[PDB]
Amino acid sequence: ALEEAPWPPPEGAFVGFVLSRKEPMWADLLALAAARGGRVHRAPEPYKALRDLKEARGLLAKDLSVLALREGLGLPPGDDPMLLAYLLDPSNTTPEGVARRYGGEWTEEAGERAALSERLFANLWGRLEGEERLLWLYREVERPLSAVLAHMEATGVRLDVAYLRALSLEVAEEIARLEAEVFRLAGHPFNLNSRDQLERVLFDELGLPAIGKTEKTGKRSTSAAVLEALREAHPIVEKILQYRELTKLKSTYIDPLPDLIHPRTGRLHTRFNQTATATGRLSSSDPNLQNIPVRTPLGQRIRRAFIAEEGWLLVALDYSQIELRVLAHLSGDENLIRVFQEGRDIHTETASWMFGVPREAVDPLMRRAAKTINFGVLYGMSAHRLSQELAIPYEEAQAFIERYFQSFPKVRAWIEKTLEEGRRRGYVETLFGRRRYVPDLEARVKSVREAAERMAFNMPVQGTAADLMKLAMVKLFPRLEEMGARMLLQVHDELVLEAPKERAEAVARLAKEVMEGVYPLAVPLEVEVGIGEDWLSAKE
DNA sequence: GACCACGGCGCC
DNA sequence: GGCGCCGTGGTC
C-alpha cells in the first residue's frame, strides 16, 4: 500500500515504534517509523532518528516520549488514537482491541504501527468530531495530560534502598518466628503460602468451621475476613493473619522495589496508564506506586522509604473527602452541600459514631476506618454486609444505612435518575461528559443487573473526581516547571511533588490553590497538604 | 522460561 | 466501586 520513502518524515507524521519490552524507561528502542501522505519512512538507526522528531504522534505516544526524555530529548507526546478511543468508550484499553475495532491490526513492525496510527486516528477523529464534550476532554485534558505523565514517568521518585534491604532482614526473621509457631500449632510443616494446603489444615485437620467459599472454584475460603472471624476459635489464626500481613508487604514491596532502581537515574519509575480504567481514573504499574502501604506500622516503615532528593522536600497534596463533595454537586442535595459549606468532616463524625467517642476523640486510624463505612454504604453495600464489618447487629447495621439516605434525600433521586438515564442511553457520564457504557443495566438476572447498577452510579462520582484531578494536573504542571519543582506521582486524589527546600512552602501553597480552584462546584474543594523528607512525613 | 486462573490483598 | 501484583498450582 504505502510508498517507502527515506527517513526523515515530514512534520506532523504519525510514528510507529517497537520496544524490547513494555516499560519505556527500561526498553531498548528496536525500530522506529513514521507515516504521512501515503508514505512510510523507516529510521535506519532508531535512536539517532529520534532526534528528527518534533512531537510523538501516534498510538502509545507517551511511551515513546518517556523513552525520548530518558535519552535527554524533549519530545512531547501529541495526538494518540488510544486516547480518542478511550474517550469514545473506556473499554478501549489496548492497541490490539482498538486496532481491531477501528480499522487495522496491531503488529510488531514499526512501519505498520506508523501506518496504523495514521489510519486509526483518521477514523477515530471522525467518530469523535460530533461529540463536543468528549472533544473538550481530549483537547483540554487527555492530550495535554499525556505530556505531564511522560515527565512524571521519566522523572521517577527516589527510594531509600539501603533502608529497605536492612528492613528485609528484620522482617524475614519475624516471618520465620510466625511460620515456626504456625507449624508447631498445626502439628507439622506445610507451605503456609499455599491457601489450598492452609484450607486443609484449618478445616480438615484442626476442624475449624468453614465460613465462606471462594467465587470461581468453591473452595473453603481462608481470606482475612474468614480468619478475622475465627480469631477466637484457635490460636493458629492470629499467627496466620500476622504471617499474611508480613509476607504480603515483604513480597510486594520490600524485596522487589530495591531491584527496580534505574541505573541512569538512581530512581524508581512507574508507568501511569491513561487508558486502563472504566471510570477515567489513571492506573499505575511496573511497579504500581499507587498502592504503597500506609495502614499498618510495617506499611508505614515502607512508605518512609520514598524520599526527596538531597536538598529537596516531598510535598503531598490530598483532596478532602473528594467524592462525597462531587456527589454533593452532582445530586444537588442541600443537606450534603450544607455539610461542606459549613466546613464539616463526615468521616470524623462517622468515626466518632462508630467508635462511640467525641468528635475530638477520633484519630487517623479511626477516621480511616470510617471511610470504609461511608463509601461502603453510598456505593450500595447491604445491611447484612455492614453488620459483618462493624461488627454490630443487623437492624442496627440496617438503621445506619437508612438514616444515612434520609439525611441526604436527593442522593437517592440522583441515583435513580442516573440509572434510568443509563438504561435508556446505554451509558452514564461524568460532570464533563466522560462516558461509561453499562449494558447490563437491563440484565434479567438480578445480581448481574444490581452489580451493573452499582458500577453505573459509581462512575459519575469516581470519574468526575478523576476528571477534576487530571485537569488540576494539567493546570498545575506548567506552574511547577517555572518554579523548578517536579510532579512525581498521582494517587487518584493525591499528588506528590518534589521541590527545592527553599521553595517547598511556596510550592505547597501554589499547588493547593490550583487544586482547590480547578473547577468551582456548589461546594468548596479542600486540599490537605504536607511537606517532608519522606512520603510518610509529608502527610500531612 | 512464559503464560494462565485463582485466591488473596495492597491502595484510592 | 476502581485498580495491579503476589505465590500457587497449573500448562506448554
Ligand SMILES: Cc1ccc2c(=S)n([C@H]3C[C@H](O)[C@@H](COP(=O)(O)OP(=O)(O)OP(=O)(O)O)O3)ccc2c1
Ligand atoms: C476500603 C475502601 C473502600 C472504598 C474506598 C473508596 S470508594 N475510596 C474513594 C472515595 C474517596 O473519596 C477517594 C479518595 O480516597 P481517600 O482515602 O483520600 O478518601 P477521602 O474521602 O478523600 O478522605 P480524606 O479526607 O482524604 O481522608 O477514593 C477510597 C477509599 C476506599 C477504601
Ligand SMILES: Cc1ccc2c(=S)n([C@H]3C[C@H](O)[C@@H](COP(=O)(O)OP(=O)(O)OP(=O)(O)O)O3)ccc2c1
Ligand atoms: C494564591 C494564594 C497565595 C498565598 C495564600 C496564603 S499565604 N494564604 C494564607 C494567608 C492566611 O494566613 C491564611 C488564610 O487562609 P485560610 O483561612 O483558608 O487558611 P488555609 O491555609 O488556606 O487553610 P484552608 O486549607 O483554606 O482551610 O492562608 C491563603 C491563601 C493564599 C492564596
Ligand SMILES: [Mg+2]
Ligand atoms: Mg483524600
Ligand SMILES: [Mg+2]
Ligand atoms: Mg487520598
Ligand SMILES: [Mg+2]
Ligand atoms: Mg484557603
Ligand SMILES: [Mg+2]
Ligand atoms: Mg486546611
Ligand SMILES: [Mg+2]
Ligand atoms: Mg483477579
